[PDB]
């Protein structure tokens, strides 16, 4: 295969194919961010839908001024 | 040999030529963008942003340029209608040229990567096989994405180093590109608050830098690597497609209901603005207050800007088009020239009567007039022999306040009926039907066409997600099931746990 | 030797218990008069 | 013309509220369902006789 | 009839382009065996 | 074949019919009462034959507000009381 | 274990349905929903 | 530098040609009325 | 189709629900009927001289 | 021109029929 | 040997009804959509949202009962039981249409669950997942009609109501308002559903009449064995038959059964696309050339102009009772009518 | 600030949570008592 | 109100009756679960 | 400019048809 | 439309040039 100057520079960025953390690793923590992000998308949706109504959040064109 | 529907699978284990394919796709997209803009500029009329804005002219990329702050032409005009400007290099023309030069430069890079496919970079140094470390690639690209997202919000949208974005008042009358300050409180999640868009990119950009950094440094768990086949580039195609159709639904939705990033001077009004009579309320608020404050009827309506009256017309309602009614809205009802005036109908008793407005659902709709209380007092009858509410019988007249016909009254029945027929569309306008040989049938707006295309592509990409995810997870049986599957693994009760051959009894 | 209460048992009665109850309500209804 | 016929039929006969038409729909929806089912079930259980580079 | 003038070119290309593609792939398939 | 008791063998068993000759009519009677007592009307808010219109009314009491709709039907229901 | 013969279960179950369904058709003519 | 080893022959048999042409001609026959409008 | 050819037509529940006073309480069958009526009165708009379309 | 187009396409389909039937790939056993 | 694995073990046991991880989404949502429909159709009215009776309790029968859509004034409100509309009151929630969103949303997640089940079981058994893929067509139809269509409209009110006659009304609405029969995406759907029914019938009949004689009895069903290797009917005789009767026939069993998947799945997918167009009133309502000619030439008449008159009758005759929130008052003299009728 | 609909939101959030966890409390228990042998 | 006891009473007796006819066998199944 | 709008289709086909001929012949040459 | 057409044909020829130089049949010395 052809070596190039730029290839040698980027080399170590494509050098760990297949390396994994053992067992479950960080999965529990991922699940927390996933659950937080869901609730946050819920809120964003229910704001747009007007089933979450909040003080000073006027979901209308009339909130350009 | 390969079937036609599989010719591009030859790239799956060829990172170089995959990059070359991707480069070529990027070139074609950048070229389209340049070609589309150039066509749009060759056909756009900038002489009237009031009654012949871009959204009436079937302009599709122009508003996206204007959204992020490109507003002038090297020809000296601007989309806000001011003349004498110098936009510098980043005119519509210059944006178009840049995308064409980009397309050209991408095309060459593509050639080079197609010929010099066999770069040592793409080889796993342990095995000599081609191999992409996709977990680290994600961290790198995610980090890049976070930087750009941050910069876009931190410098472009704010005006710290950039133009800002298109903003307007609630009635789409005085838009312009302005720098926008981040809204950091709960109203930044309001889709109609432009500062929320600033905050979003700054905050989400920073989260992307951190996640990026996480994904470059921390290796995926063994359990997740094996569950999601992270050695298989097709699991990326599956999840990437999923994310794309999610995004496509979102952008269709906000285009149809409207948000701070789909303003009505660039895309036209929403159908909901007609449903709720958004502009009619405001218009009446102004007349009502012009009159309390002394002014005459002539004066209160002459005060109504034509641009606001023109929103209060169903021919700009995007829900009035048809799939095969092609081209700009101007090809249908024509090129708007002038507001004719607000039409006031009275019967022979001097009662003011109101034309029932056509709902968006109806291709045709009858002509029915009512009093302030909703009682029918006149109509255009179908069957004449038992008609009781005809204009002839009720002595209906139309008077005009404001606009071209201000202070004119018509009493001859066929004329009165004729304006009544138009008043169901809302406010009444004079159109040029000859210049485009307009056929008189409503077409939809860029807001309509964009929503349709993206909701359709979104749904189709959902099938893409399903296909390629199935293919990722069942790669081992793509070609067929194992010819020595034995009936014991399939018949019931043999194994306590399905497919788990270690659980016989 | 057969279990009595199973996942099966539960799915069965999930559907069958309210069916009969609903049938009895719908039976009473044929005698409602205006 | 076919559409003109089915519209007039509905107004003169209320074909949608006729049970034999309802059985046709079940026959036609059902027929398309079982076509899809059977084609997908056979296709799912094809015995491996080929490589990924060739039509199964 | 006052019909869309581009209908013709649209129809012609809609037919010709996908058909030519299939013909190209068939004839070169046959030149193999 | 999965180890649950066969259905055929259950619905001929004396024990089965001993329970279900009670459980099946009790549920049938239970549901009957839900209607015969009028409870079903009140739980679900379904109008009785006599409570669709007020006497001289021929207006549907149609909900016309999103967040005030609860209050609307409450008003329509007193317009009968 | 298998005391009730299955054919008997089927017939009584069978008539139970006919009875209830028959009631529902009777009620199409009487009371609410009858046009009268 | 080697010739690229991933290259593969492409096939479309005669039946697939007939099926594909029918598809395209019937599609054209269906949409052309809408294209002329 | 072959039996509706002899005019033995779909179920008709037009005004089958009325209230204690005798008001008609519409169902979806009544809404269907309003559509059928729109088809009836418009089809072959010039062909009928008499008030019932008996064939 | 629209009439010519419609008939042309129909004519092509009819010719395609001819080849599909009489110039099919002939099915061959085992 | 952690808990997650133990639960996997239990979820995936071979039992009369397989459960799976996907069972966790599927079974509650399917049971609730179904129970919502049987609860509403038995007991709940549509009086306050539609001006209609719609339950057995009220005197409706199986054909006219429905769980009706919410009032048009609800917009696209989720109509959560605990949301600002119903404010936790079960009764009002029922009366405002809450069961419509309950069924539609739980139905949606059930459908997802069912397709996850097809994926889950196919992996455990070792077969290709083409039955799941096929099921994408039902999903596409359901979302396009019950979710996307009304989300493009003014409210959920204009979605289909969950009932027999209510759907019949939905068909006729689409004729009169969208001229949906004229739509080429509906046409491709019709060809896929009818084409599929044809395939289903012609394939079943062909196998049943090219059978090999594998038993002595006159009931030919006894003479198949699920583990036999031999085909149970002659592809060869089948092919010669159809080649001579029709001119072409299948020769490849694999292509035949893939085609049987392909035809109805695609038809349904095409119709979904067209209903997405109709979410926006993006109709194939008209042919412009016909209208220009007919406006100018009062002797020019086609079945296309005839059918629009019918659509026009439909709209004007059904609109006031079908859209009560619009308070349409059409006096007699404005209704379109032909002579005498 | 803290409006009826936000209280309603939290009501919905906790109900969902109750439901999913109770569901998983049951599933985790059964799966421990009735294990596959191997 | 009081109609809720009318409604629920039969189903409790049904649950009661079935509780008592099956209890001895239901405890044999639970014993077998280790 | 008031040009002949059959000129678009004539130019289009003038290019498409003979070019497709050429391509078909080249590609089947390369595969034998 | 006529400008687009003239520009498109011109642009096809420039692309022909590129392939004919860089992707020619290499001349070789048999
Ligand atoms: C395929 C796989 C399927 C798997 C899916 C599984 C099921 C998932 C279930 C998701 C449920 C989605 C809820 C959507 C509710 C909705 O939308 O609710 C609508 C609300 C917006 O509400 C509407 O807003 C409208 C516009 O109002 C605006 O305009 C008015 C007039 O100017 C006033 O100014 C008003 O104040 C101003 O807000 C009208 O008022 C409507 O009455 C009101 O309902 O959007 C919002 O909640 C959010 C809108 C943006 C989010 C993107 C939505 C994506 C879905 C749409 C994509 C299809 C596009 C449809 C277009 C066709
Ligand atoms: C998407 C992620 C995200 C991020 C990065 C932020 C970031 C921010 N939020 Mg926002 N927020 C989010 C989501 C997010 N929010 C969502 C989903 C909601 C629900 C609508 C809110 C609702 C919200 C409110 C009501 C307020 C903020 C505020 C703030 C700011 C910090 C306030 C502080 O120091 O308290 C610590 C904050 C954090 C550690 C991070 C976020 C914690 C939550 C989201 C909000 C905390 C509320 C706070 C205690 C109330 C103080 C004011 C009181 C008088 C009501 C900061 C710019 C406050 C602000 O700037 O005033 C306008 C504020 O009052 N946010
Ligand atoms: C996201 C894509 C997109 C969108 C939303 C728009 C939107 C718009 N364009 Mg642009 N355009 C695009 C892409 C897009 N364009 C591209 C890629 C090109 C280059 C080809 C152009 C070139 C272009 C030109 C040249 C013009 C526009 C114009 C317009 C406007 C009118 C559009 C119209 O009449 O459509 C009509 C749409 C249809 C008739 C629907 C066609 C879709 C068919 C029905 C589907 C095909 C079915 C398929 C065969 C089914 C088979 C499946 C099965 C067998 C498996 C509108 C604002 C016009 C304008 O006014 O500009 C000034 C104009 O003149 N556009
Ligand atoms: C990022 C998007 C993306 C990417 C990179 C791929 C990539 C791939 N697909 Mg997936 N796929 C996607 C989206 C995508 N797909 C979507 C959205 C769908 C749903 C329609 C599918 C459905 C799908 C199926 C059913 C199959 C694939 C297969 C494949 C592989 C071979 C495809 C091939 O050779 O085409 C060859 C294609 C042609 C020779 C011509 C196609 C002509 C099309 C019909 C019209 C062209 C339209 C035009 C170019 C406009 C562009 C589209 C517009 C949206 C921008 C390849 C890995 C195949 C596979 O798995 O093989 C193992 C396969 O069987 N794909
Ligand atoms: C989702 C909605 C829905 C669905 C699924 C259906 C489904 C159906 N409708 Mg209903 N219908 C609907 C809505 C719907 N309809 C609505 C809204 C209305 C009111 C407007 C009606 C009004 C209605 C009427 C009035 C009729 C139907 C009929 C039918 C059936 C049509 C299929 C058929 O007849 O196959 C049968 C097969 C054929 C008719 C074809 C025979 C083909 C011959 C034998 C050979 C042809 C050869 C060909 C010419 C050449 C090919 C060779 C090649 C070389 C060219 C089917 C049960 C029809 C029916 O029941 O007819 C019996 C009918 O007359 N429907
Ligand atoms: C498990 C499958 C399942 C799924 C997918 C759904 C899905 C849905 N249901 Mg259904 N439901 C289910 C089972 C299910 N339900 C069951 C078992 C019941 C019987 C009790 C019901 C009864 C029911 C009703 C009565 C209603 C719904 C409704 C809904 C919708 C809204 C749910 C919502 O807003 O969540 C919000 C909540 C969540 C998404 C929970 C997220 C959990 C996070 C991750 C954890 C939070 C932990 C907590 C905050 C921390 C502790 C707090 C501290 C005090 C210690 C949605 C379509 C509503 C609907 O259809 O409206 C029309 C509705 O009114 N469901
Ligand atoms: C009206 C027509 C129609 C119905 C009723 C139907 C029904 C079904 N199709 C299934 C399968 C399929 N359908 C397929 C192709 C097709 N299916 C078609 C048309 C239909 N398919 C067509 C035309 C095709 C051709 C492409 C395939 C390929 C499959 C399957 O593999 C699968 C199966 O196993 O077939 C044997 C089953 C999925 C079971 C399920 O999800 O349970 C879970 C139940 C859930 C999740 C609840 C959903 C609730 C719905 C969405 C809303 C509520 C509905 C109300 C309760 C009822 C209202 C009724 C009134 C409106 C009248 C189910 C029996
Ligand atoms: C590669 C080449 C082969 C591709 C071309 C093949 C021809 C296919 C033609 C398809 C287009 C048919 C258009 C006919 C109308 C026409 O001729 O009018 C021509 C119209 C232009 O409109 C013209 O404009 C003029 C002034 O601007 C005047 O107004 C004319 O009256 C008006 O006709 O063409 C366009 O609008 C073309 C762009 C359409 C792009 C929008 C598509 C978005 C929809 C997405 C849907 C995806 C669905 C996928 C489903 C699977
Ligand atoms: C070389 C070079 C150059 C040049 C460049 C150029 C010249 C380019 C161009 C480019 C371009 C010029 C491009 C274009 C593109 C386009 C395209 C890519 C398109 C697409 C399309 C499509 C895809 C469509 C489709 C469709 C249809 C047709 C119908 C409807 C539907 C749809 C939309 C689907 C330069 C100097 C710079 C530099 C150096 C080098
Ligand atoms: C909603 C809701 C819920 C739930 C509910 C449910 C879940 C229910 C269920 C329900 C159900 C579960 C019911 C059932 C019913 C049933 C029925 C009612 C049946 C009937 C049937 C019949 C009548 C039949 C007969 C027949 C005929 C007719 C013919 C053929 C034969 C036969 C025999 C089949 C909850 C609580 C969460 C809360 C919220 C709301
Ligand atoms: O339905 Mn109506 O009915 Ca049998 O005829 Mn009398 O009108 Mn006319 O001719 Mn064709 O159509
Ligand atoms: Cl007619
Ligand atoms: Cl007559
Ligand atoms: Fe078969």
Q: What is the 3-state secondary structure (H, E, C) of G1-36?
A: CCCCCHHHHHHHHHHHHHHHHHHHHHHCCCCCCCCC
Task: Check pocket membership of K31 for ligand 10, CB cut-off 6 A.
Answer: yes
The total number of structural domains that make up chain B: 2
Q: How far is the CA of K1 from the centre of ligand 4 (A)?
A: 41
Q: Specify which residues B336 forms β-bridges with.
A: B431
Q: How far is the CA of B364 from the centre of ligand 10 (A)?
A: 43
> Which residues in chain B (7-26) have CB-CB distances under 8 A to chain D?
9
Residues of E in contact with H17 (CB under 8 A): 22-23, 25-26
Closest CA to B220 of A13, A32, A30, A15: A30
3-state SS class at B369: strand
Task: Check pocket membership of B471 for ligand 4, CB cut-off 6 A.
Answer: yes
Chains with 3 or more CB pairs closer than 8 angstroms to O? N
- Which residues have CB under 8 Å from G12's CB, separation 6+? none
Closest CA to K189 of K156, K151, K135, K140: K140
HEC string for chain K? CCHHHHHHHHHCECCCCCCCCHHHHHHHHHHHHHHHHHHHHHHCCEHHHHCECCCCCCCCCCCCCEECCCCHHHCCCCCCCCCCCCCCCHHHHHHCCHHHHHHHHHHHHHHHHHHHHHHHHHHHHCCCCHHHHHHHHHHHHHHHHHHHHHHHCCCHHHCCCEEHHHHHHHHHHHHHHHCHHHCHHHHHHHHHHHHHHHHHHHHHHHHHCCECCCCCCCCHHHHCCCCCCCCCECHHHHHHHHHHHHCCCCCCHHHHHHHHHHHHHHHHHHHHHHHHHHHCCCECCCCHHHHHHHHHCCCCCCHHHHHHHHHHHHHHHHHHHHCHHHCCCCCHHHCCCCCCC
Q: Which domain holds residue B280?
A: 271-443
8 A C-beta contact, residue B353 and residue B396 = yes
How many angstroms separate the CA atoms of F69 and K157, rounded? 15
Any idea of the CA torsion for B448, B450, B452, B456, to the nearest 10 degrees?
-170
Q: Which domain holds residue K13?
A: 1-341
Closest CA to B352 of B401, B293, B402: B401
A34 in any annotated domain: yes
- Report CA B440 to chain centroid distance, whole Å: 25
Determine the residue of I7, I44, I48, I49 to mutate for testing ligand 11's pocket, defined as the one with the most ligand atoms within 8 A of the Cβ atom: I44
8 A C-beta contact, residue B429 and residue B340 = yes
Q: Which domain holds residue A10?
A: 1-51
How many angstroms separate the CA atoms of G18 and K63, rounded? 19
How many angstroms separate the CA atoms of B396 and B417, rounded? 9
Helix axes N6-30, E6-30, angle to 10 degrees: 10
Question: Which H or E element spans position B377?
Answer: strand B376-379
Q: What token pair was written down for K142? A: 């359901």
A14·B132 Cβ contact <8 A: yes
Length of chain B: 505
The total number of structural domains that make up chain K: 1
How many angstroms separate the CA atoms of B22 and B233, rounded? 14
Around Cβ B304, how many Cβ atoms within 10 Å?
23
Closest CA to K337 of B367, D13, B389, I37: I37
How many angstroms separate the CA atoms of K309 and K67, rounded? 32
3-state SS class at B165: strand
How was this structure obtained? X-ray
- Report CA K68 to chain centroid distance, whole Å: 16
Backbone angles phi, psi at C2, to 5 degrees: -135, 140
Q: What token pair was written down for G25? A: 């058709």
Place of tokens 């770069």: B119
Place of tokens 């796709």: B25
How many angstroms separate the CA atoms of B358 and B366, rounded? 8
How many angstroms separate the CA atoms of B15 and B8, rounded? 13
How many angstroms separate the CA atoms of D47 and B479, rounded? 8
- Regarding whether B372 and B500 lie in a shared domain, the answer is no
How many angstroms separate the CA atoms of K312 and B364, rounded? 8
- Which residues in chain M are immediately followed by a break of C to N over 2.5 Å? none
- Stated in angstroms to one decimal place, the resolution of this structure is 2.0
Longest dimension (CA), chain L: 58
Region of B423 (left: φ > 0; alpha: ψ -120 to 50; beta: rest) is: alpha
A14 in any annotated domain: yes
How many angstroms separate the CA atoms of G23 and K255, rounded? 51
- Which residues have CB under 8 Å from B302's CB, separation 6+? B401, B402, B403, B406
**Strand spans (E) along chain D:** none
8 A C-beta contact, residue B319 and residue B359 = no
- Regarding whether B228 and B136 lie in a shared domain, the answer is yes
Q: What token pair was written down for B348? A: 């022979």
**b/e burial code for range K125-159 (CB count within 10 A of at least 16 → b):** ebbbbbbbbbbbbbbbbebbbbbbbbbbbbbbbbb
Determine the residue of K145, K151, K158, K272 to mutate for testing ligand 1's pocket, defined as the one with the most ligand atoms within 8 A of the Cβ atom: K151
Nearest chain I residue to G30 by CA distance is I16
B497·L36 Cβ contact <8 A: yes
Q: What token pair was written down for K99? A: 């069961």
Q: How far is the CA of J12 from the centre of ligand 3 (A)?
A: 27
A45 in any annotated domain: yes
Nearest chain B residue to F4 by CA distance is B493
A61 in any annotated domain: no
How many angstroms separate the CA atoms of B448 and B270, rounded? 9
Closest CA to K283 of B329, B334, B335, B360: B360
Indicate which CATH number applies to the domain containing A46: 1.20.5.880
Cα distances (angstroms) measured from residue K13 to each of B4, B498, F53, I31, K120: 42, 6, 57, 50, 13
Backbone angles phi, psi at B276, to 5 degrees: -85, 5
Cα distances (angstroms) measured from residue J28 to each of B287, C31, K17, K238: 85, 71, 45, 14
How many angstroms separate the CA atoms of B94 and B99, rounded? 9
Place of tokens 């529940």: I13
CB-based burial label for K94 (10 Å; 0-12, 13-18, 19+): buried
Question: ∠ CA(A31), CA(A35), CA(A38), 5° rounding?
Answer: 140
Q: What token pair was written down for B307? A: 């641009």
Question: ∠ CA(B3), CA(K185), CA(K70), 5° rounding?
Answer: 125
A63 in any annotated domain: no
Question: β-strands B408-410, B428-432: how paired?
Answer: unpaired
CB-based burial label for M33 (10 Å; 0-12, 13-18, 19+): exposed
8 A C-beta contact, residue E31 and residue N31 = yes
Domain end call among B407, B424, B443:
B443
Taking the CA of K29 as reference, the closest ligand is 6
HEC string for E10-30? HHHHHHHHHHHHHHHHHHHHH
Closest CA to B261 of B153, B360, B148: B153
- Regarding whether B313 and B234 lie in a shared domain, the answer is no
Closest CA to K313 of I37, I52, B387: I37
How many angstroms separate the CA atoms of B49 and B66, rounded? 13
CB-based burial label for K73 (10 Å; 0-12, 13-18, 19+): buried
How many angstroms separate the CA atoms of B82 and G3, rounded? 96
How many angstroms separate the CA atoms of K186 and K24, rounded? 35
8 A C-beta contact, residue A61 and residue B170 = yes
3-state SS class at I32: helix
3-state SS class at B342: strand
- Which residues have CB under 8 Å from K271's CB, separation 6+? K141, K185, K186, K188, K189, K192
Q: Specify which residues B409 forms β-bridges with.
A: B399
Q: What share of chain N is helix, strand, coil (3-state, %, to 5)?
A: 80, 0, 20
Backbone angles phi, psi at I18, to 5 degrees: -125, 160
Closest CA to F34 of F26, K99, G23, K98: F26
- What is the residue with the minimal CA distance to atom 29 of ligand 8? B327
CB-based burial label for J23 (10 Å; 0-12, 13-18, 19+): exposed
């Amino acid at each position: 295969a052809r070596r190039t100057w730029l290839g040698d520079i980027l080399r170590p960025l494509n050098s760990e194919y297949g390396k994994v953390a053992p067992g479950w690793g960080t999965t529990p923590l991922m699940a927390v961010f996933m659950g937080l992000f869901l609730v946050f998308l819920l809120i964003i949706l229910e704001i747009y839908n007007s089933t979450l109504i909040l003080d000073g959040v006027n979901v209308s064109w009339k909130a350009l001024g | 040999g390969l079937p036609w529907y599989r010719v591009h699978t030859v790239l799956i284990n060829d990172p170089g030529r995959l990059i070359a394919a991707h480069l070529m796709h990027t070139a074609l997209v950048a070229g389209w963008a340049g070609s589309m803009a150039l066509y749009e500029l060759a056909t756009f009329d900038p002489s009237d942003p009031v009654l012949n804005p871009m959204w009436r002219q079937g302009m599709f990329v122009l508003p996206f340029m204007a959204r992020l702050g490109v507003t002038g032409s090297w020809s000296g005009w601007s989309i806000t209608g001011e003349t004498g400007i110098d936009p510098g290099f980043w005119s519509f023309e210059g944006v178009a040229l840049a995308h064409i030069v980009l397309s050209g430069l991408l095309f060459l890079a593509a050639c080079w990567h197609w010929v010099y496919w066999d770069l040592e970079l793409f080889r796993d140094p342990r095995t000599g096989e081609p191999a992409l470390d996709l977990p680290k690639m994600f961290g790198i690209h995610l980090f890049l994405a976070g930087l750009l997202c941050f910069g876009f919000g931190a410098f472009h949208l704010t005006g710290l180093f950039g133009p800002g974005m298109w903003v307007s008042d609630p009635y789409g009358l005085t838009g312009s590109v302005q720098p926008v300050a981040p809204e950091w409180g709960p109203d930044g999640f309001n889709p109609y608050n432009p500062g929320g868009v600033v905050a979003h990119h700054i905050a989400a950009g920073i989260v992307g830098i951190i996640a990026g950094l996480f994904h470059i440094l921390v290796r995926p768990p063994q359990r997740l690597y094996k569950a999601l086949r992270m050695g298989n580039i097709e699991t990326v195609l599956s999840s990437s497609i999923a994310a794309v159709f999610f995004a496509a639904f979102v952008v269709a939705g906000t285009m149809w209901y409207g948000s701070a990033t789909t303003p009505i001077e660039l895309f036209g009004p929403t159908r909901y603005q007609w449903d709720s009579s958004y502009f009619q309320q405001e218009i009446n608020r102004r007349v009502q207050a012009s009159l309390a404050s002394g002014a005459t009827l002539e004066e209160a309506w002459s005060a109504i800007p034509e641009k606001l009256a023109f929103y209060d017309y169903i021919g700009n309602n995007p829900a009035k088009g048809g799939l095969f009614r092609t081209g700009p809205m101007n090809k249908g009802d024509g090129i708007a020239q002038a507001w004719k005036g607000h039409a006031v109908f009275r019967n022979k008793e001097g009662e003011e009567l109101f034309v029932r407005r056509m709902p968006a659902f109806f291709e045709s709709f009858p002509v029915i007039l009512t009093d302030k209380n909703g009682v029918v007092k006149a109509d255009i009858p179908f069957r004449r022999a038992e008609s009781k509410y005809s204009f002839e019988q009720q002595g209906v007249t139309v008077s005009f306040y404001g606009g071209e016909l201000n202070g004119q009254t018509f009493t001859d029945p066929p004329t009165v009926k004729s304006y009544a027929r138009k008043a169901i569309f809302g406010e009444i306008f004079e159109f040029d039907t000859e210049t485009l040989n307009s056929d008189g049938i409503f077409r939809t707006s860029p807001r309509g066409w964009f929503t349709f295309a993206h909701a359709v592509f979104a749904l189709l990409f959902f099938f893409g997600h399903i296909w390629h995810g199935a293919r990722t997870l069942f790669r081992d049986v793509f070609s067929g099931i194992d010819p020595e599957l034995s009936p014991e693994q399939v018949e019931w009760g043999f194994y306590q746990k399905v497919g788990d051959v270690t659980t016989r009894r | 030797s057969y279990p009595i209460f199973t996942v099966r048992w539960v799915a069965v009665h999930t559907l069958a218990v309210p069916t009969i109850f609903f049938l009895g309500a719908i039976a009473a209804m044929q005698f409602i008069q205006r | 013309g076919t559409f003109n016929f089915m519209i007039v039929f509905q107004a003169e006969h209320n074909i949608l509220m006729h049970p034999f038409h309802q059985l046709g729909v079940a026959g036609v929806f059902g027929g398309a369902l079982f076509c899809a089912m059977h084609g997908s079930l056979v296709t799912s259980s094809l015995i491996r006789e080929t490589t990924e580079t060739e039509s199964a | 009839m006052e019909v869309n003038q581009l209908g013709l070119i649209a129809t012609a290309l809609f037919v010709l382009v996908p058909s030519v593609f299939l013909i190209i792939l068939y004839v070169q398939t046959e030149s193999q065996q | 074949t999965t180890g649950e008791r066969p259905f055929s063998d259950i619905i001929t068993s004396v024990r089965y019919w001993v329970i279900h000759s009670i459980t099946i009519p009790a549920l049938f009677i239970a549901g009957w009462l839900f209607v015969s007592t009028g409870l079903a009307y009140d739980v679900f808010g379904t109008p009785r034959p006599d409570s669709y219109y007020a006497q001289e009314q021929r207006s549907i009491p149609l909900v016309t507000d999103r967040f005030e709709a609860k209050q609307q039907v409450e008003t329509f229901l007193e317009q009968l009381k | 274990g298998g005391r009730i013969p299955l054919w008997i279960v089927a017939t009584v179950a069978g008539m139970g349905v006919i009875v209830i369904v028959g009631l529902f058709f009777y009620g199409a003519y009487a009371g609410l929903g009858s046009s009268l | 530098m080697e010739p690229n080893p991933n290259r593969q022959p492409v096939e479309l048999n005669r039946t697939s040609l007939y099926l594909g042409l029918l598809l395209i001609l019937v599609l054209a026959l269906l949409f052309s009325s809408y294209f002329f409008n | 189709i072959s039996t509706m050819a002899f005019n033995l037509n779909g179920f008709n529940f037009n005004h089958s629900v009325i209230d204690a006073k005798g008001n008609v309480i519409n169902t979806w069958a009544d809404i269907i009927n309003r559509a059928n009526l729109g088809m009836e009165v418009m089809h072959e708009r010039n062909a009928h001289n008499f008030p019932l379309d008996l064939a | 021109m629209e009439t010519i187009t419609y008939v042309f396409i129909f004519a092509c389909i009819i010719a395609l029929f001819f080849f599909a039937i009489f110039f099919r790939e002939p099915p061959r056993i085992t | 040997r952690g808990w997650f694995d133990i639960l996997d073990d239990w979820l995936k046991r071979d039992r009369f009804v397989f459960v799976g991880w996907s069972g966790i989404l599927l079974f509650p949502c399917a049971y609730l959509a179904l129970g919502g429909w049987l609860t509403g159709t038995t007991f709940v009215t549509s009086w306050y949202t539609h001006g209609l009776a719609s339950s057995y309790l009220e005197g409706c029968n199986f054909l006219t009962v429905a769980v009706s859509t919410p009032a048009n004034s609800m917009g696209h409100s989720l109509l959560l039981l605990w949301g600002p509309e119903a404010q936790g009151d079960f009764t009002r929630w029922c009366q405002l249409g809450g069961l419509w969103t309950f069924i539609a949303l739980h139905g949606a997640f059930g459908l997802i669950g069912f397709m996850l089940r097809q994926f889950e079981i196919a992996r455990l058994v070792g077969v290709r997942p083409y039955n799941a893929i096929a099921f994408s067509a039902p999903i596409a139809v359901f979302v396009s009609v019950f979710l996307i269509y009304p989300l493009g409209q003014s409210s959920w009110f204009f979605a289909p109501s969950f009932g027999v006659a209510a759907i019949f009304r939905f068909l006729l609405f689409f004729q009169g308002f969208h001229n949906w029969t004229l739509n080429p995406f509906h046409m491709m759907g019709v060809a896929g559903v009818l084409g599929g029914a044809l395939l289903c019938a012609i394939h079943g009949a062909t196998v049943e009449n090219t059978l090999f004689q594998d038993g002595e009895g006159a009931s030919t069903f006894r003479a198949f064995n699920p583990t036999q290797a031999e085909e149970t009917y002659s592809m060869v005789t089948a092919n010669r038959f159809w080649s001579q009767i029709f001119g072409i026939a299948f020769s490849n069993k694999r292509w035949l059964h893939f085609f049987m998947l392909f035809v109805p799945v695609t038809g349904l997918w095409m119709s979904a696309i067209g209903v997405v167009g109709l979410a926006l009133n993006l109709r194939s309502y008209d042919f412009i050339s016909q209208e220009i000619r007919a406006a100018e030439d009062p002797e020019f008449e086609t079945f296309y102009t005839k059918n629009l008159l019918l659509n026009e009758g439909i709209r004007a005759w059904m609109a006031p009772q079908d859209q009560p929130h619009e308070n349409f008052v059409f006096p007699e003299e404005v209704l379109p009518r032909g002579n005498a009728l | 600030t803290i409006t009826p609909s936000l209280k309603g939101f939290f009501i919905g959030l906790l109900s969902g949570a109750v439901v999913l966890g109770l569901t998983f409390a049951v599933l985790i228990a059964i799966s421990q008592i009735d294990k596959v042998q191997r | 109100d009081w109609r809720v006891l009318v409604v629920l009473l039969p189903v409790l007796l049904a649950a009661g009756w079935a509780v008592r006819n099956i209890l001895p066998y239901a405890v044999k199944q639970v014993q077998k679960l280790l």
